[PDB]
């Protein structure tokens, strides 16, 4: 499995539709309003703001606090590497009662279930979950209630080194001497070992 935030966001979006979809608004296709941040298509088209309440998913960054390389192994003749990653994600609810919805979303991510569905879709484990503020932003006319939350994930990624190769034959030479630097060696041992 390779690590790609584009897939983690999609998996989280698909999971949230079932986990917390009953509290959200629904579009013309009856689907709950969960979307990825900064919507756009065809390199210039821009999405419209859905009907409230809705959810936004945005991946912040990715780091490797756990060393630099976790494993190096051979799976088939191609060499492989494994690396441990950490990915903080930001989920926000916009509308009225955003805090009341974020609280229930928090209380469900900690269940034994749900954490299995997340791993089934994204193949990642939930590591931490931060606090929830209760924000108000003026916009125009009326304030909008919002409630962000940060959910950190952990995943292992594997890549293939197509430039690598393996050793399958070894040739060894040796000598024996009574004294250091004895120019004609007392004995010479030549060895050759094949994998087969």
């Amino acid at each position: 499995m390779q690590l790609e935030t584009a897939e983690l966001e999609k998996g989280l979006v698909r999971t949230l539709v079932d986990v917390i979809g009953h509290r959200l608004a629904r579009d013309k296709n009856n689907r709950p309003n969960v979307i990825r941040a900064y919507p756009s298509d065809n390199s210039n088209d821009k999405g419209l703001k859905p009907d409230q309440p809705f959810i936004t998913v945005y991946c912040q960054d990715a780091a490797t606090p756990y060393g630099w390389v976790l494993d190096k192994f051979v799976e088939d003749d191609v060499v492989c590497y494994r690396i441990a990653f950490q990915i903080p994600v930001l989920i926000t609810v916009n509308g009225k009662g955003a805090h009341s919805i974020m609280l229930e979303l928090k209380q469900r991510l900690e269940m034994s279930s749900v954490r299995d569905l997340i791993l089934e879709e994204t193949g990642a484990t939930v590591l931490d979950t931060g606090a929830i503020p209760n924000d108000y932003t003026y916009l125009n006319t009326d304030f909008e209630n919002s409630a962000p939350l940060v959910v950190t994930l952990v995943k292992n990624s594997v890549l293939k080194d197509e430039r690598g190769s393996i050793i399958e034959r070894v040739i060894v030479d040796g000598e024996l001497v009574y004294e250091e630097g004895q120019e004609p060696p007392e004995y010479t041992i030549h060895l050759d070992v094949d994998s087969k």
């Binding site: 441990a84 900690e110 484990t125 590591l127 952990v154």
Partner: protein, 140 residues
């Protein structure tokens, strides 16, 4: 799989334990080293393989965690039993990521927790002993 603190499960005496402290809620340690080398005056080395294999298991819980009542009740029962009956039970720890592959063969409660009542909720530390702290492996 990869490590996450929400998957660790500890079971002792048939009950389950939850309400772990936010950090450093479990510790394991052997009592003695595997080998004690001895060096003579001439630089020769000989090895002694210690037969000691006991260990200690420290687990921290929140002050209001329900597991505190269960352990206190279990300890109270054992104070009113004759020496013929036993008190040891296997301490089993499960972790899907394989970070902690160990288990206490015959584990007995050893020390009661210290209590502090500062500003915010504090933690309680329970210490168990074991006859053999086994370190298992997932590879043949």
């Amino acid at each position: 799989q990869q490590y996450s603190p929400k998957d660790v499960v500890c079971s002792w005496n048939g009950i389950a334990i939850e309400g772990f402290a936010p950090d450093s809620f479990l510790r394991l340690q052997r009592t003695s080293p595997l080998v004690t080398p001895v060096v003579g005056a001439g630089g020769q080395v000989a090895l002694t393989r210690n037969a000691d294999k006991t260990g200690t298991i420290e687990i921290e819980l929140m002050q209001t965690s329900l597991s505190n009542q269960m352990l206190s009740a279990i300890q109270a029962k054992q104070d009113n039993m004759e020496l013929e009956e036993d008190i040891s039970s296997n301490f089993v720890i499960y972790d899907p990521s394989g970070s902690v592959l160990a288990t206490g063969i015959n584990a007995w409660l050893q020390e009661l927790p210290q209590i502090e009542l500062g500003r915010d909720q504090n933690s309680k530390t329970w210490i168990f002993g074991c006859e053999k702290l086994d370190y298992t492996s997932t590879i043949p």
